[PDB]
Design a protein around this ligand. Structure first.
Ligand code: 3GM
Ligand code: 3GM
Lengths: 149, 149
């Protein structure tokens, strides 16, 4: 459970935003990419797994599940690749709502950043620091620390 | 102390590797960039600070310390910018040894990755997971968790 992440791909300004969500905490990392290819997803997962202990990833769609480059990255990083089928249906809505929320933050920072990629990183910052009272950043650290001990 | 990071810029294959080191743990994040400009450094710091609680950054050189874009990023993210002058002289050697180490890992993975950027991320992974017995990844989580509670 502390090692479970969910991939989520959303769109804005004819551009692609790739998000990884730490399921137990709501903590995220995100990137703007030209298009959602196997290669982009594979590279994104390698980066994520070098930064946090990623044990299982619920992939966002079947093309990434199938991709040989994604499978190579998951093998390299010791990640168990699983589907992202919301057997628990409330998953779809939670993801959808987060995409709403992130797009809203992006809109709020648009006067400050010239480029979408910058606004996305500002949105990651705001999301992970937001007190909901604990923040996502605080929850992921405690969950993983408790897991180690 | 749990919030202190050190910037470190090193070179390989006529390309630039930008590293941020969590001083108390040895945990790192890194990126390949075309050149070390204010803009690249500013963007790198924004990303880092959305992902971990960055309170103070010891900048790697005077150009980044001075850069108005770096200052804007640090202001935005709530980061105290400080010099990286090794008042403790043993800092230079510790950084230098890590750069050795990272370049060595990059060489060991060079058959597996077509592109330097991929090899750098593999090196980040290996460094943060390496048991020294605790790993850098384990130390940063415990340090920050202890700081919160
Ligand atoms: N050519 C056959 C290679 C065999 C093959 O599949 N290798 C695996 C091995 C391996 C091991 C770990 C992670 C990925 C990979 C794959 C490598 C790879 C994937 C995505 C990339 C890559 C490269 C690269 O090879 O460095 O380059 C950077 C690029 C940046 C984002 C973009 O631009 O998409 O994403
Ligand atoms: N519109 C007013 C001027 C904007 C301006 O400079 N303000 C500050 C405000 C602010 C607030 C937080 C972080 C950075 C910044 C600066 C923004 C910025 C910096 C680096 C960048 C940027 C942009 C951007 O502007 O989005 O673009 C992406 C690029 C990353 C790609 C790469 O180079 O790796 O690096």
């Amino acid at each position: 459970s502390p090692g479970i992440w969910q991939l989520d791909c959303t769109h804005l300004e004819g551009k692609v935003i790739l998000v990884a969500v730490h399921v137990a905490s709501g903590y995220i990392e995100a990137e703007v990419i030209p298009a959602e290819t196997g290669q982009e997803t594979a590279y994104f997962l390698l980066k994520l797994a070098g930064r946090w202990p990623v044990k299982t990833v619920h992939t966002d769609n079947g093309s990434n599940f199938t991709s040989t480059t994604v499978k190579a990255a998951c093998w390299w990083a010791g990640i168990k690749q699983e589907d992202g089928i919301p057997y628990n249906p409330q998953s779809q809505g939670v993801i959808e709502s987060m995409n709403k929320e992130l797009k809203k933050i992006i809109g709020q920072v648009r006067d400050q950043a010239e480029h979408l990629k910058t606004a996305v990183q500002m949105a990651v910052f705001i999301h992970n620091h937001k007190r909901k009272g604990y923040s996502a950043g605080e929850r992921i650290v405690d969950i993983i620390a408790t897991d180690i001990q």
